[PDB]
Amino acid sequence: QTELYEIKHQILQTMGVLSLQGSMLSVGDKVFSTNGQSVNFDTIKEMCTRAGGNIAVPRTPEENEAIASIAKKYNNYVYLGMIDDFHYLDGASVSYTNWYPGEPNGQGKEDCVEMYTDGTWNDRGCLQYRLAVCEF
Amino acid sequence: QTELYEIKHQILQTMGVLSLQGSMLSVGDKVFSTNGQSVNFDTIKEMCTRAGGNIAVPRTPEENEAIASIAKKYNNYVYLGMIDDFHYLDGASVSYTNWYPGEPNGQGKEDCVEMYTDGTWNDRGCLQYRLAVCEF
Amino acid sequence: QTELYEIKHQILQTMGVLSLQGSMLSVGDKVFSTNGQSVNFDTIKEMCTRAGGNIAVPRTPEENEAIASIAKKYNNYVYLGMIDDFHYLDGASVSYTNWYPGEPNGQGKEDCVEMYTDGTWNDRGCLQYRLAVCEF
Ligand SMILES: O[C@H]1[C@H](O)[C@@H](O)[C@H](O)[C@@H](O)[C@H]1O
Ligand SMILES: O[C@H]1[C@H](O)[C@@H](O)[C@H](O)[C@@H](O)[C@H]1O
Ligand SMILES: O[C@H]1[C@H](O)[C@@H](O)[C@H](O)[C@@H](O)[C@H]1O
Ligand SMILES: [Ca+2]
Ligand SMILES: [Ca+2]
Ligand SMILES: [Ca+2]
Ligand SMILES: [Ca+2]
Ligand SMILES: [Ca+2]
Ligand SMILES: [Ca+2]
Ligand SMILES: [Cl-]
Ligand SMILES: [Cl-]
Ligand SMILES: [Cl-]
Structure with missing residues (x-):
């Protein structure tokens, strides 16, 4: 007891x-x-795994708002945990989406997804330097 | 077990x-x-609540020393969780006090309380920018 | 359950x-x-104790690599928790060692041990300013 x-x-x-420190944001169980670093998609995955977590992905509008607030606060685009029919990294098809108008537009060429500072998404190549956001 | x-x-x-990081100080159960930010009294309350805590208030000499050490380390005056007979924000009358000589002196005009870097207190208006200190 | x-x-x-923040590194149970500050041996001990921990010491090659990665990342020599037959601060004789070639070479004069950024060790006086690394 x-x-x-x-x-x-x-x-x-x-x-x-x-x-309070701005070191985490809690949405439900997530x-x-x-840490404010920018690296490519694979390197973000490696950093998150190393810490015992996974590259962040928004599966709900509230989770999207949370990651967007991180993008806005650190003022950088963010790579999300999905890969081109986009799938989560666990292999399941993406449900919730928030595409910027006209996206996704890069089938066969743009396998990753980045989030803008306004929270909307764009399919993009995976080799840009983007803010590393993890989920635990 | x-x-x-x-x-x-x-x-x-x-x-x-x-x-060790300087991200917290523990005094008893508190x-x-x-985070080093300075904002007004209401905004500190909002920031602390958002993090799952409350604006800090010293109820003991040890708690006063702890918050004073924060004020001294971050080198800024701090708003305390009390409001003008001063009361804690839970509505109870304040017990422990540490007024700077001559304070409180602003009845009807100075509803808030700020702590100086030496740990003593002054009644003050609530619209200054002060170091946000929370208690959990 | x-x-x-x-x-x-x-x-x-x-x-x-x-x-993820770089605020800790976990090796087994340790x-x-x-916090990135540099002070002398006694002062590191005081800082670690204050936080509820102890000055770091590597007792295994994996622990050595971890502390070395801290030294390399913060780019400073580190004081280790051992004191001149070198002993841990708990009084036990040191098992694992990683002396730089030719060390230890300062018997009677160099009572402390510092770690270089490449992870190797040197016996040294205790009054240098070194990166404070604690273990919990
Ligand atoms: O992913 C692409 C790419 O980033 C282009 O640079 C941009 O102009 C397009 O609008 C976008 O869809
Ligand atoms: O609260 C007031 C106010 O801050 C005045 O500026 C100051 O001169 C007084 O001493 C203090 O009591
Ligand atoms: O501990 C000593 C000391 O630091 C000397 O400055 C250095 O030249 C030696 O190589 C080292 O063993
Ligand atoms: Ca695509
Ligand atoms: Ca695109
Ligand atoms: Ca007053
Ligand atoms: Ca006053
Ligand atoms: Ca020696
Ligand atoms: Ca030596
Ligand atoms: Cl690319
Ligand atoms: Cl005011
Ligand atoms: Cl010395």
Whole structure:
């Protein structure tokens, strides 16, 4: 009983501190974070995996708003965890989308997806330097 | 048994890291933190709430010293969680006080309380930009 | 059951965020961290203790690589938790070593141990300013 309450309180304290610092954003069960570095898609995947997480992907409008707020705050385009019928990296077809008007427009050439600072998406090649955002 | 020990150890590790980084200060059951931003009283309240916490207030001399050390380290005055008979934001009358000599002196005009870098207090209007310190 | 799973997941989320931020490095049960400050040996010990940890020491090749990566990333020599037969600060004789060629060479004069950015060690006096690395 009391053991568990203190434990839960301390966890919420640490998450509160991280949230206040701008080191994380929590949406439901998901936690999004960036260290502010920009690298290509594969390198973001490697960085996220190294930390025990995955490259971020928005599966809901609230998750999209959260990642967009990161893009806007750090002022850079962001690579999302999807790959060209776009799929999540787990192999499932993407449900929620937020394409910029006219996108996706690069079938066969643009396999990745970047998010603009306004939260909309563009299919893009995977070799640009983009803000690394992970989800845990 | 062992499940709980590992969990507790990991929590203390994360708190240790945050403490070392200067991202938190722990006094008893309370954790104080700032992100170094300066905004007005209402905006600090909004920032703290957003992170799952509350604007910091010292209820003990040790808590006062902790928040003072934050004010001194970030070198800015700090708004405290009290409002003019001063009350905590939970509605209770303030017990512990540490007024600068001659304060409070602004009844009816100065509804907020700021802490100086030496840890003493002054009643002040609520519309200055002050270091945002939260408690969790 | 479910209580514990959610707790464990949240802990791993916070550790993931800290890892991504570069605020910690995890090797087995140990967590290494620096705040980037440089001070002398005693002062590092005081800083680590204050945070609830201890000055870092590598007891395995993997731990050595981890601390070396911190030295390399922050680009400074690091004081290790050992003191001249070198002993850990717990009083036990050091097992794993990684001396730079020709070291240790300062018996009676060089009581501390610093790590270079390439991960090798040198016995040194204790009064230099070195990157503070703690272990939790
Ligand atoms: O992905 C492409 C590409 O980035 C082009 O540079 C741009 O002009 C297009 O609008 C966009 O669809
Ligand atoms: O709150 C007031 C105000 O800040 C005045 O500027 C100052 O001169 C007073 O000493 C103080 O009590
Ligand atoms: O510890 C000593 C010391 O740092 C000297 O400055 C250096 O030239 C030696 O090589 C080293 O062993
Ligand atoms: Ca495409
Ligand atoms: Ca496109
Ligand atoms: Ca007043
Ligand atoms: Ca006053
Ligand atoms: Ca020696
Ligand atoms: Ca030497
Ligand atoms: Cl490209
Ligand atoms: Cl004012
Ligand atoms: Cl020295």
